């Protein structure tokens, strides 16, 4: 009896909606990549009694991250040269350097090119990886650049030098970013230690397959995450609570040699290599690796009741998944991981180093789409890069009875960003509400 409407403003109630996010970052970058404003002074709070749903496999800003990371590359590649005139038939010797194994095409591949005066055609030569060129039929001396069949190759400008600079994602006023803190959250379903912010913790946009790098660790014990609509899961993500150091190195001295296509373009190639040849390789600590696989073996049989757990290395696909793929400096590495995922386990501190041989190729069919293709210029001097793995991308497999198999997969790089944006959700706030009370306006 005698209830009257009263309108409240500034109410704490929210809903789920899409919205457009924006960049924040450190003070400096190579120049939404440098972007503004600056990484602000952080703030956070806890909502206690809120019980809120989270979903990792459906949320939006994963897709925004991907749609960024593509157009963000293309915002940089276009001003650089385009190598269409270079697709001329390459005649290749392959035998000047007695250390003949790896680098195949060599000088003294040779070809015809057009100089500044469009009349004057001249003869040049450079060195290419056998993974960059493909063989023309019959004439054993004839080879062509691999991806000129169906794309317009372009050269990354040597001044750019990408690197996984951290990126904070921030949402505009009126919206907010919810965050789940319960250490055991499995990527989908309710949380009850919710918190809210306006800017996520710095994400590092790394791209790698078969195991991901430089990520932020899990705070509980090693977690496993998967979709749950079916037990037939496309990809399984293993998020670690302890980081194993991996260092990868290329020993040789590459010699950057410049060629010219006028009016104003310079095309960089690999000249004569100097120093005795050896194959680029990656290192791991046997003890730490064995321990990490033991822990993952323990955890994995949470979901699967009592079967023996056996790993096996990949068995098909391009080099993008048949090996460990990643990038250091101005080169890309493809490491034969056939000697890592070889353990097996049944139901019921840093000595010795595992070395794995790792090839490298220049022409990267940039992992996101066809049509495009990028040529990474050579880098002179020996190269080393330390790094630290933080998670594995597996996929289940059969071939055995009462014993599940698993293999490295997940070249669908989106999972990488989904391996760090599962915490967060984006909500639209509705601060305006109504309620009943014992008052109506005095005139």
């Amino acid at each position: 009896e005698n209830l009257w409407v009263t309108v409240y403003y500034g109410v704490p109630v929210w809903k789920e909606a899409k919205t457009t996010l924006f960049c924040a970052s450190d003070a400096k970058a190579y120049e939404t990549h440098a972007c503004v404003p600056t990484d602000p002074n952080p703030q956070e709070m806890v909502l206690k009694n809120v019980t809120e749903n989270f979903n990792m496999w459906k949320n939006d800003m994963v897709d925004q991250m991907h749609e960024d990371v593509i157009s963000l590359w293309d915002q940089s590649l276009k001003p650089c040269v385009k190598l269409t005139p270079l697709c001329v038939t390459l005649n290749c010797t392959n035998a000047t350097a007695s250390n003949s194994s790896i680098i195949e095409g060599m000088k003294n591949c040779s070809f015809n090119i057009t100089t500044e005066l469009r009349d004057k055609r001249e003869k040049k030569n450079a060195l290419f990886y056998k993974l960059d060129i493909v063989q023309l039929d019959g004439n054993s001396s004839q080879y062509r650049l691999i991806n000129c069949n169906t794309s317009v190759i372009t050269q990354a400008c040597p001044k750019v030098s990408f690197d996984p600079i951290p990126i904070h994602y921030c949402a505009p006023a009126g919206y907010a970013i919810l965050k789940c803190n319960n250490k055991t959250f499995t990527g989908t379903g309710p949380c009850n230690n919710v918190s809210t912010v306006q800017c996520t913790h710095g994400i590092k946009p790394v791209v790698s397959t078969q195991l991901l790098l430089n990520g932020s660790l899990a705070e509980g014990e090693i977690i496993i995450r998967s979709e749950n609509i079916t037990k037939n899961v496309k990809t399984i993500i293993v998020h670690l609570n302890e980081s194993v150091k991996i260092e990868c190195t290329r020993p040789n001295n590459k010699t950057r040699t410049s060629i010219r296509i006028g009016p104003g373009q310079a095309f960089y190639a690999t000249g004569q290599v100097i120093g005795d040849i050896r194959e680029a390789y990656c290192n791991i600590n046997e003890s730490k690796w064995n321990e990490t696989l033991q822990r993952v073996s323990k955890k994995l049989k949470e979901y699967f009741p009592h079967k023996n757990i056996t790993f096996q290395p990949s068995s098909g696909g391009d080099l993008e998944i048949t090996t460990h793929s990643f990038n250091c400096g101005g080169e890309f590495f493809y490491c034969n991981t056939s000697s890592l995922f070889n353990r097996t386990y049944m139901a019921n501190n840093s000595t010795r180093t595992i070395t794995i041989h790792c090839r490298i190729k220049q022409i990267i069919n940039m992992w996101q789409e066809v049509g495009r293709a990028m040529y990474a210029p050579p880098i002179a001097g020996n190269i080393t890069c330390i790094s630290n793995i933080t998670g594995l991308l597996l996929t289940r497999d059969g071939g055995k009875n009462n014993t599940e198999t698993f293999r490295p997969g997940g070249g669908n790089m989106k999972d990488n960003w989904r391996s760090e944006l599962y915490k967060y959700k984006v909500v639209k706030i509705e601060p305006l509400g109504v309620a009943p009370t014992r008052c109506k306006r005095r005139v």
Binding site: F22, G174, K440, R441
Partner: protein, 122 residues
């Protein structure tokens, strides 16, 4: 620049009345950036001017005319007024919010009639 943006989580209907002040403050300070700005303005005005329809103007809380129909939410909220938080009630009353907004608008409407009909004598 923000703080206390939803700190009132866990408070009840009126118990969340205090901090309402600050949760209504935060608006402070490559193309996506530009978009993010425009939204911030629009989503603000669409709320600020809406109160103008209902005659509340620049107040966080305000009585009004028209009774709180025991219809809509066929319920009494006094007895839960101290043991529930807002969401469980906003989601409950969603059934009739669109109507109640029109009711508040009409509530505000008669105010200017009543005011002019008296002020025209001075």
């Amino acid at each position: 620049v923000f703080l206390g943006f939803l700190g009132a989580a866990g408070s009840t209907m009126g118990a969340a009345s205090m901090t309402l002040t600050v949760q209504a403050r935060n608006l402070l300070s490559g193309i996506k950036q530009l978009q993010a700005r425009v939204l911030a303005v629009e989503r603000y005005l669409r709320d600020q001017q809406l109160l103008g329809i209902w005659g509340c103007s620049g107040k966080l809380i305000c009585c009004t005319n028209v009774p709180w129909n025991s219809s809509w939410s066929n319920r009494n909220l006094s007895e839960i007024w101290d043991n529930m938080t807002w969401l469980q009630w906003d989601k409950e009353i969603s059934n009739y919010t669109q109507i109640i907004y029109g009711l508040l608008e009409e509530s505000q409407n008669q105010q200017e009639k009543n005011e002019q009909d008296l002020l025209a004598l001075d």
